[PDB]
Design a binder for these strands. Structure first.
Ligand SMILES: [Zn+2]
Ligand SMILES: [Zn+2]
Ligand SMILES: [Zn+2]
Ligand SMILES: [Zn+2]
Ligand SMILES: [Zn+2]
Ligand SMILES: [Zn+2]
Lengths: 187, 586, 585
RNA sequence: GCGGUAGUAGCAUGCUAGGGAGCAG
RNA sequence: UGACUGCUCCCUAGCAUGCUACUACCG
């Protein structure tokens, strides 16, 4: 309140009225002793009820503008994370076996369900039981999707390496059974 | 929108507009640079302007706050608030405020329209951050002055070495010479298609580059101005004298390529930075080759600034150096591809400032510092920051192509920070052993500025010829001509068998092109031809004004030839301070 | 997070924020610690910080708690009360507070470098728990300063025995490799097993402790854990037990010792005891005695290192069953000789590093010198035994007091176990003058151990003495002594049996360099734990400050059996000592 | 004697936001 | 790892209205 431009009048009117109490004041000067700090006090309160509103308004943009900054800084951290993805899932397209089906296409459009089926290098087979295993993945090589795949690893549900000799007809009760066979393309 | 006040570095959120590049002036510091200049606009997280119906009132200094938008006096809501007041513009982080007594330079740097030498004098007496800001804004104003050119529309072509080109209406013809490489980009239907690196000859038309494009219909020739990136890393670091040799391994034997290089290792390996102050043709091209081989256990790099000057660094490289052991970089601008490309792991890297890989090193060389602006040093330090580096070059050479200053000449010291810091505290070295050069240049540069500290080595056989022909200059159009030059050259080769296998120097490429159209001479650059000087050369008058030949242009041009130096007087040039032979013209 | 202000014994929930260990301070310690000492930060269940976008005024100064959070002055949503007011700080337990009369504890110890003499001497006049906290703050300051040092690395693999190493540039680098450097390696982005390396000599010669495989770029840096809080005192009040009831004494009694039944009955009717024992004072063979005499007694045996355990374990399996010991190994120098991974026995040995807490009945440890109260507290909290027989000596091989800046304090004023003894008196009589000769015992019991040991065995007039002043010549980073090693070598040639000793020296580089032309194995000085041998070559320097300051190596003289070699350049330890004096040639 | 006007404190209603929790398809 | 909607109780901060006393000028 030490810089409000209505402190001078209030201060002076207080001094004139209050400080001059000991001195004999007649009933005519008493009006000046009374109706001089009055009105001035009203105006000061008016000069303080507007300052309090300007302060709050001000401290509602120095908070709503930190939030406009925060979000743009964030908008630049996700815009650079999707970019770092769509350029890492691209360096992975064996562009000899992929430009060989987009080319044999009538216009260059192909179904998406035949891209991993004809242009992939690895196969993952998930097998529930032993009966399913001998009709799908018997031996070290097997044919699927008009191709030939050679087994490379057989992990299990626990993710521990199984060998192709632990898989018997009677040792089967001793394996975590969802078995995951990883195979590579041949030729 | 929150960063370092160009000046105080504290975090701000503001940023002027006057400043084309738009730096992050802090809070307080805006009160100086905002009121103390035409610079008024301001942009913080949100832009400042009377959001009131299509208004047009700005100068924040006058604009007031209120509500949640801003309003100057335009229509300030009852609950307004001066946006501008107590030395501070309302902006994020207000207590970290500080500002600094630095609006001094800051204000001259901001206000400097870059027309007189005083712009460069005041730009060169400031602090590190002010220096960076001044270099950035200088490059900005120069490129945005340079892009003020139209397009060249081409629809047909007759044959090779011929083309009918015409600039737009109201736009003058872009300058003749090749200092502004014509990297054009035509259009096919929607985007920019490649053209190639080009350069003009005259308004016959010989293409001195190495490329071939199928030009025809719809071709658009343009001048490409790259969007400059903001500079971050400093251009230098204060040094400190140590005692312990860390990492460096002196060789068990002596690579006695040179004799004085032992003092070079004794004087250079101690301090954190130095400079090879070598006179022209006194070992300014292959001392770094010796330092490369005397310290094989230290990572050593070389950067350059021009594609032309790669002759000396390549000939001895094939003569006595391997291919695989070195490394080169070229993107897909154009240069030799003899060596290994794309090899971040090597001991002898050659590279140019156009593009470098982010890596650190311990010893670098930086050829032609005198051609390079402070921005070039700062960018080559930011892209590749290494422990020690040496700036190949000498201040006593030609100025950089600063076409922004015309009336006033450019003194050496104000070329860059190094070309004065090395004058004040003293040069770090001085050489006087010219490998392959007569002592004429030795005497000349000893009398001029060396004060006769290095003396004549080879006998002055008085084989240099100088005459008293002045010539007459005349200007007609944007390109200039010299009538007493088509005949003067013929009058000088009338009966001299020795220079029938000589080259031609081209201070002004226009006159050289005209004379080659009349008679026919190979074109040779003046600026980017240091170290490529032929044995037998002729110096032509070629000019009569103060535009190029005032003091510091002939020092490297009178030492091109080895045995026969015929350098005719062209102006009041030192004529009555020494003696000179003279063949009497018929 | 409800700890305890043991500066008052008050139960609180605050802690000083910008402080060493961030300990629990009450509303009456954390009131005056912040105003005088600038620790304008307190930590509670939630930190006392502003809670409004961007604020950077975090000082529990006049912060006001309102609207379920701590706001600030500058921007004022005041409508609340300040956090610090009426001689207290806000927080739980704001009513049940006691206060402290010693205001300047943190004001004196939380700002200094934890090395001043005044701090130590006022610490040694504190209570047991405050001094436990002082020792934990000494460990914590050591570990805090452990991450303000350098890092080694190798970026270029060279031929064996000739490598190069750079540590750092322009920072304040000496370190008596005491605890050696085992960092971990890197190849491209992950961690790779490297092992443990030892750098003693140092293009730069490299020795090899064990075969390894260097890779490009391998770094070396040490990471140390934080000492956890303990819940047990160090010393115990004196309280004589009722009787020797509850024990299983044995019918047979030893006869080669004439002070065995008396001390057995004494420990029977005594609870805790401390002594001042030099090497070879009952630690060698009396542990086996109490082992055989007291079979059912759960005797725990531990040393500060496995190498002092080896001294008793070597012969502890000949007279007694092999299974009588049991130590655990982690997965420090050791060896897998015993039955490991067996923490159940009657004579379960122990280790300072780690061991599970099951049961104990008798306290007997070996040298407990190279540590502060930390060792006593960790061994009292790890296991609480009925009887305490503290073998060893509080001042035998003391831990180096990190960075010394102000001289060295007088041994008399140690942490807890030296001033109590020489202010109340010895408790028990014990001495083994079998190994040690009298020439050492006389002076050692003349200096500090008056009337404690008797001159049992005579001297064969072999001790070497020659007053040589010599000339010292220091350099920028080291110094090499020409005169004294040369005269020592010249004296050694005069006896034919002198090439079966070791090469031990105060400095590792000196003896390492000097062994390249004599051919002697490298040895250093960290702790000669339970390792006594006949021949030895002793040295010092830099005397003045590092060697000739106090009797840091008086007990350490007792390793030999029929004579030792210990030259000295001063006139304070030979005023009555009778080493054979001879003149140089 | 009364009315109007502008601040201040105190008690309930509705609405707009944030936070924690419960149920239903 | 934690979807889309709807209803509802409790606590805190802000805005306007509703009967009063206090101020002070004005009638
Ligand atoms: Zn501006
Ligand atoms: Zn407006
Ligand atoms: Zn600033
Ligand atoms: Zn603290
Ligand atoms: Zn307390
Ligand atoms: Zn706040």
């Amino acid at each position: 309140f030490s810089s409000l431009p209505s402190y001078a009048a209030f201060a002076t009117a207080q001094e004139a009225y209050e400080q001059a109490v000991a001195n004999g004041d007649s009933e005519v000067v008493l009006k000046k002793l009374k109706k001089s700090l009055n009105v001035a006090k009203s105006e000061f309160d008016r000069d303080a009820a507007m300052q309090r509103k300007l302060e709050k308004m001000a401290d509602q943009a120095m908070t709503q503008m930190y939030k406009q900054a925060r979000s743009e800084d964030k908008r630049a951290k996700v815009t650079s994370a999707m970019q770092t993805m769509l350029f890492t899932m691209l360096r992975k397209l064996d562009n000899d076996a992929l430009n060989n089906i987009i080319n044999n296409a009538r216009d260059g459009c192909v179904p998406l369900n035949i891209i991993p089926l004809t242009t992939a290098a690895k196969l993952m087979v998930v097998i529930p039981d032993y009966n399913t295993y001998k009709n799908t993945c018997d031996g070290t090589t097997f044919t699927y999707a008009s191709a030939l795949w050679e087994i490379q690893q057989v992990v299990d549900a626990d993710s521990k390496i199984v060998q192709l000799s632990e898989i018997s007809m009677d040792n089967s009760p001793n394996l975590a059974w969802p078995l995951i066979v990883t195979a590579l393309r041949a030729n | 929108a929150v960063g370092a006040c160009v000046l105080c570095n504290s975090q701000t959120s503001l940023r002027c507009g006057a400043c084309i590049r738009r730096p992050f002036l802090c809070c307080k510091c805006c009160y100086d640079h905002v009121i103390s200049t035409s610079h008024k606009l301001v942009l913080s997280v949100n832009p400042y302007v009377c959001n009131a119906p299509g208004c047009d009132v700005t100068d924040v200094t006058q604009l007031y706050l209120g509500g949640m938008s801003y309003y100057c006096k335009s229509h300030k809501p009852p609950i307004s608030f001066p946006l501008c007041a107590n030395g501070q513009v309302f902006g994020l982080y207000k207590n970290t405020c500080v500002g600094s007594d630095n609006v001094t330079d800051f204000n001259a740097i901001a206000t400097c329209d870059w027309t007189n030498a005083g712009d460069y004098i005041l730009a060169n007496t400031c602090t590190e951050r002010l220096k960076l800001f001044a270099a950035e804004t200088l490059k900005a104003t120069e490129e945005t002055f340079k892009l003020s050119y139209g397009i060249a529309t081409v629809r047909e072509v007759l044959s090779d070495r011929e083309l009918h080109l015409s600039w737009e209406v109201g736009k003058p013809r872009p300058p003749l010479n090749r200092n502004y490489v014509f990297t054009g980009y035509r259009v096919t239907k929607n985007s920019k298609v490649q053209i190639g690196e080009y350069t003009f000859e005259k308004g016959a038309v010989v293409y001195r580059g190495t490329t071939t494009y199928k030009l025809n219909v719809g071709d658009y020739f343009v001048l490409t101005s790259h969007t400059v990136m903001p500079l971050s890393a400093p251009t230098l670091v204060p040094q400190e004298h140590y005692v312990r040799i860390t990492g460096l391994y002196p060789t068990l034997n002596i690579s006695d390529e040179f004799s004085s290089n032992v003092a070079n290792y004794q004087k250079v390996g101690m301090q954190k930075y130095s400079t090879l102050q070598g006179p022209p043709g006194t070992g300014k091209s292959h001392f770094a080759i010796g330092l490369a081989l005397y310290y094989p256990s230290a990572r050593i790099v070389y950067t350059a600034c021009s594609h032309a000057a790669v002759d000396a660094l390549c000939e001895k490289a094939l003569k006595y150096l391997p291919i695989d052991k070195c490394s080169r970089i070229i993107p897909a601008v154009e240069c030799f591809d003899k060596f290994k490309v794309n090899s971040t792991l090597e001991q002898y890297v050659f590279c140019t400032v156009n593009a470098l890989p982010e890596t650190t090193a311990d010893i670098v060389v930086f050829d032609e510092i005198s051609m390079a602006t402070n921005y070039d040093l700062s960018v080559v330090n930011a892209r590749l920051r290494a422990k020690h580096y040496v700036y190949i070059g000498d201040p006593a050479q030609l100025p950089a192509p600063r076409t922004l200053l015309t009336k006033g000449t450019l003194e050496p010291e104000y070329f860059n920070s190094v070309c004065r810091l090395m004058k004040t505290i003293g040069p770090d070295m001085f050489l006087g052993t010219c490998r392959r050069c007569p002592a004429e240049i030795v005497d000349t540069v000893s009398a001029l500025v060396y004060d006769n500290k290095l003396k004549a080595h080879k006998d002055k056989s008085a084989q240099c010829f100088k005459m008293f022909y002045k010539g007459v200059i005349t200007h007609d159009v944007s390109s200039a001509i010299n009538r007493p030059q088509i005949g003067v050259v013929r009058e000088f080769l009338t009966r001299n068998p020795a220079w029938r296998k000589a080259v031609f120097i081209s201070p002004y490429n226009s006159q050289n092109a005209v004379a080659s159209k009349i008679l026919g001479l190979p074109t040779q650059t003046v600026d980017s031809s240091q170290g490529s000087e032929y044995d037998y050369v002729i110096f032509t008058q070629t000019t009569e004004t103060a535009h190029s030949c005032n003091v510091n242009r002939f020092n490297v041009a009178i030492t091109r030839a080895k045995v026969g130096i015929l350098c005719i007087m062209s102006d009041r040039d030192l004529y009555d301070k020494l003696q000179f032979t003279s063949l009497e013209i018929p």
